[PDB]
């Protein structure tokens, strides 16, 4: 049971969100901090179950150039593929 917590109001940028993920998901140092990289890690690194708690999700959308949604979609898509991911949008 891996816990990943994103504090949405802390995010200063899309790159800052990937860095938060690199930390919370304990991704490798070469993590490319992009959507393709994230997908690679979700299906080829992260151990499950995973609980992704995304606090102030709504603020994080503006603090990213609308990039938070595409990051969310990748988690949703991993979940759809059968990864045991609990997604909390708070």
């Amino acid at each position: 049971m891996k816990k990943a917590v994103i504090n949405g109001e802390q995010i200063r940028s899309i790159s800052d969100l990937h860095q938060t993920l690199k930390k919370e998901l304990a991704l490798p140092e070469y993590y490319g901090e992009n959507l393709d990289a994230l997908w690679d890690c979700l299906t080829g690194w992260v151990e499950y179950p995973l609980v992704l708690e995304w606090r102030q999700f709504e603020q994080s959308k503006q603090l990213t150039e609308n990039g938070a949604e595409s990051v969310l979609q990748v988690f949703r898509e991993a979940k759809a593929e059968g990864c045991d991911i609990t997604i909390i949008l708070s």
Binding site: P28, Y30, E33, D36, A37, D40, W45, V46
Partner: protein
Amino acid sequence: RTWREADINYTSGFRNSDRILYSSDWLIYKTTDHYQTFTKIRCAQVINTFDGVADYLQTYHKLPDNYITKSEAQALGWVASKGNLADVAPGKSIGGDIFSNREGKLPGK
């Protein structure tokens, strides 16, 4: 156009940041910075393994035999966290999975 990806330069341990990306019309790209940037394989002399696999792909239209998808590797008890791929599937690499070109860096669908 659809895309697929395979790992490059993988021997043992944890996975690395190198990938070859190939399309349904046999465009072929590589990334060595984990999908941050891509460069078109534009071949030349077959010196390195990116060149090797790209020229295989163009010739046979499939990955070499040393490749298994992620679901196949898992089926054999692959745990990326541990980095035990060379354990459950000796001499194998991950490759052949659909690649969604999510950042739009490669030529569109």
